[PDB]
Design a protein around this nucleic acid. Structure first.
Length: 439
RNA sequence: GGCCAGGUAGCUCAGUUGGUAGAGCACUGGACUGAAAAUCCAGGUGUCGGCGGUUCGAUUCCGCCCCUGGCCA
């Protein structure tokens, strides 16, 4: 332990007004962390507490006070979730028990993954003596995220990704012992539950420096052990894997710059699609950039490798428990991923016509901007000539402007609607349709 | 409380733009054989989990709930 507006939160008062006299409560986890790091409070607040009283009644009355929902789940801990559009509050209360309070505190802290997460403070001193037996402060000053002990990483293998994510997110450098431990057994990641790996994988794709972490998870073979399919890109010598990596990185450089490639109506709904509740479609675009060609080593002489791509992606989505909607998204993104290049190649000959455009926007109108961005970043990774790229953005311009404006007996009904739609581009018309269909 | 997948005949499983719910096995009958196994032919009235919406028409499209399981880093 080393030496209120610095560690204040509005709701803390409420907790103290719930928490009984005899029992004591400590604030642990990422709150004290992010605060020490001096990063400002976001729109999503997550606070983990350690209390000596019954966390369930605590959480029930707390939630009753702030008008939050109540939660109990597996030790056995209690949650309170209060969610309105601008902000989200997750409070997780955890039990603490012992004949010696300080001893048990230190004993809990020491079991934690990283010194940056083991720093804790007493509730009373919030409303400035801190508890950091791992000495998290010292590392946080050096700007280094260092695991407490390797045994606690091995305990819950999924933490091995956290160490990457956190270090990228909070922008810190992992220590040597972490990277050494990953070099030892990169396969350990498979021992942890699947949806955790998925969820962490997405939490890494979320940020815009993600290409460096994905390269990292590749280079230690962790991204291989999770998804062996990525390991198979190297079995074909053009380099395919480096290609997918730089395509990813360029997809981030383009996505940040997205306003100046795509139109406004194409940016309108972009980013607005939700999957797994905290993640948008941008991460799906980054995934479909990683898998953009997953099928090339499967089929070569690469004729079918796009559909093969779709099938492999889909298998990865089923396996890793992604959304069926999201995995279908990524799979369709890898399926049509080569479409704008054929449209550009058709445009360079001036052979692109209303048919190709109408097909384009009927077949896939929703993945269009993602498809365009991905095609532009893949063109930038392939190192296309400037003229070729200019032609590409011009093609995109053509399609965009086409959609912009120029786009505004069971069998019998089907052909009736189809021919009515062809005519829109009258009982006598219906009778004539019937005569044309019957004859 | 959040996300995700399953719910279909007695059991267990197909059904990617919507167009009268099938297949295999099991069960029964018959042909065959001294007998049997084997082989061959024949037999689905299923409130597609429930209530609603869009369509001429919903297992599939959309909304709201029940139940089962997985996860909550």
């Amino acid at each position: 332990x080393x030496x209120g507006l610095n560690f204040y939160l509005s709701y803390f008062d409420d907790v103290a007004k719930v928490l009984p006299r005899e029992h004591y409560c400590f604030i642990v986890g990422g709150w004290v962390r992010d605060r020490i790091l001096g990063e400002p409070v976001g729109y999503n607040i997550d606070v983990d507490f350690l209390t000596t009283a019954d966390p369930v009644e605590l959480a029930k009355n707390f939630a009753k006070r702030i008008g939050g929902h109540f939660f109990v789940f597996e030790p056995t801990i209690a949650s309170v979730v209060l969610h309105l559009p601008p902000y989200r509050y997750r409070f997780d209360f955890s039990p603490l028990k012992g004949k010696d309070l300080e001893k048990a505190l230190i004993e809990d802290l020491k079991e934690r993954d990283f010194t940056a997460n083991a720093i804790a403070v007493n509730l009373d001193d919030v409303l400035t003596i801190v508890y950091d037996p791992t000495g998290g402060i010292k590392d946080l000053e050096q700007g280094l995220l260092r695991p407490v002990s390797i045994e606690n990483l091995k305990r819950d293998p999924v933490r091995v990704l956290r160490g990457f994510r956190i270090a990228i997110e909070k922008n810190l450098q992992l220590t040597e012992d972490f990277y050494e431990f990953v070099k030892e057994d990169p396969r350990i990641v498979l021992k942890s539950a699947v949806e955790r790996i998925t969820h962490e994988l997405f939490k890494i794709m979320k940020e815009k420096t993600a290409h460096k972490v994905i390269r990292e998870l590749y280079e230690y073979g962790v991204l291989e052990a999770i998804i062996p399919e990525i390991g198979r890109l190297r079995e074909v010598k053009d380099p395919l894997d480096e290609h997918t990596l730089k395509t990813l990185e360029y997809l981030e450089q383009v996505i940040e710059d997205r306003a100046k490639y795509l139109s406004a109506e194409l940016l309108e709904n972009f980013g607005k699609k939700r999957v797994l509740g905290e993640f948008t479609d941008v991460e799906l675009l980054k995934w479909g950039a990683l898998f953009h060609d997953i099928g090339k080593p499967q089929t070569f002489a690469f004729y079918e490798h796009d559909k093969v791509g779709a099938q492999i992606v889909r298998e990865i989505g089923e396996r890793l428990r992604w959304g069926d909607e999201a995995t279908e998204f990524v799979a369709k993104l890898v399926r049509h991923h080569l479409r704008p290049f054929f449209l550009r190649e058709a445009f360079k000959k001036g052979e692109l016509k209303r048919r190709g455009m109408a097909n384009f926007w009927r077949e896939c109108g929703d993945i269009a901007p993602h498809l365009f961005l991905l095609s532009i970043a893949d063109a930038m990774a392939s190192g296309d000539e400037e003229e070729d790229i200019k032609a590409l953005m011009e093609t995109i311009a053509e399609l965009e402007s086409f959609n912009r404006n120029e786009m505004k007996x069971x069998x019998x009904x089907x052909x009736x609607x189809x021919x009515x739609x062809x005519x829109x581009x009258x009982x006598x018309x219906x009778x004539x349709x019937x005569x044309x269909x019957x004859x």
